Amino acid sequence: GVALGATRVIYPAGQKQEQLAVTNNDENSTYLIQSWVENADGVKDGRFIVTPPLFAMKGKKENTLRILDATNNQLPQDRESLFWMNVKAIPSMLTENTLQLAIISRIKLYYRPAKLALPPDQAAEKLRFRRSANSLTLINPTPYYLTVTELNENALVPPMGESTVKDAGSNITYRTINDYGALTPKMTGVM
Amino acid sequence: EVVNAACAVDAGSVDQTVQLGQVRTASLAQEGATSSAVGFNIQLNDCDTNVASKAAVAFLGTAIDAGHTNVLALQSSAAGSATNVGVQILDRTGAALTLDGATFSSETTLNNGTNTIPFQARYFATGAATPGAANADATFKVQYQ
């Protein structure tokens, strides 16, 4: 099977390109790898260009995809902007009667402006909460897309936005997945 | 500070394939008839168990017809394929899975030192089955948190 080198990709504005590794751990097989970017609405609007859009992997190898900013600088420059990287691995081989399977790895592609005020190290620590009888509202005052998980459903709270999740209790804890697809320490919710 | 990498996905066979066995057409006589189900495991390897467990997965595929959207169309043959039969994918519990972007949580287990998810596949009758090659395709989609 083939995997990507990351769970997410941060694209700093001004950067000409970014790399993303693709690895076929199997030496006895061949895949066709077709990858493309979509926007927050899953529409392939071509704001970001992936090369190569389509290429073959035969056996134990590692290829590198290149993601190029072609937004013409028209994305918001005050806050992150969400996109999706989609890399589709398609097997290629015959005995009859089988289910053939292709795999899609879909990861977040964050367009991050420059000269941002709040360092990314300390963004999660700003998460605020608003309980409502049967619904908890998470408030994210940061220009960063906050990814809340182990919140006691998960939540992706957009920058300068909010996000609501549906006999719940009182005290609340959470943590987040940082730029390194890794987990921040646990934190206590604040109203 | 090192970034987490995504999982390498596998599906039993190395050709991402699943043997559905013969199609006993006399046993697929009418709509709703079903073959016995063959199990297969999807494996998420070489990734933090947190990334795998946290991920959300689904199955995509073209339905056999507008009438049965949770059943896969058969891959069409040159000689012609079986008719009024499709492939259906079930969860660990024999329940059939939809075939749209309707994603759900992976529920991976560190069974076999690696994060694996069980599934099943069977034939679903749509009318009287008629002999024919009965291959089928489907995209598994893994979306990462």
Curated annotation (Swiss-Prot), chain A:
GO biological process: cell wall organization; chaperone-mediated protein folding
Major localization listed first in the record, in broad terms: periplasm
Single GO MF annotation: protein folding chaperone
Subcellular location: Periplasm
A GO term from the CC aspect: outer membrane-bounded periplasmic space
Keywords assigned by UniProt, alphabetized: Chaperone, Fimbrium biogenesis, Immunoglobulin domain, Periplasm, Signal
Family, similarity comment: Belongs to the periplasmic pilus chaperone family.
Role, per record: Required for the biogenesis of type 1 fimbriae. Binds and interact with FimH.
Full protein name: Chaperone protein FimC
Source organism: Escherichia coli (strain K12)
Residues represented out of the complete protein: 37 to 240 of 241
Curated annotation (Swiss-Prot), chain B:
Disulfide bonds: C7-C47
GO terms under cellular component: pilus
GO terms for MF: identical protein binding
Keyword Signal assigned: yes
Keywords for this protein: Disulfide bond, Fimbrium, Signal
Compartments, as annotated in UniProt: Fimbrium
GO BP annotation list: cell adhesion; cell adhesion involved in single-species biofilm formation
Cited function: Fimbriae (also called pili), polar filaments radiating from the surface of the bacterium to a length of 0.5-1.5 micrometers and numbering 100-300 per cell, enable bacteria to colonize the epithelium of specific host organs.
Family designation: Belongs to the fimbrial protein family.
Protein known as: Type-1 fimbrial protein, A chain
Organism expressing this protein natively: Escherichia coli (strain K12)
Lineage, broadest ranks: Bacteria, Pseudomonadati, Pseudomonadota, Gammaproteobacteria, Enterobacterales
Gene behind the chain: fimA
Shown segment, full-protein numbering: 38 to 182 of 182
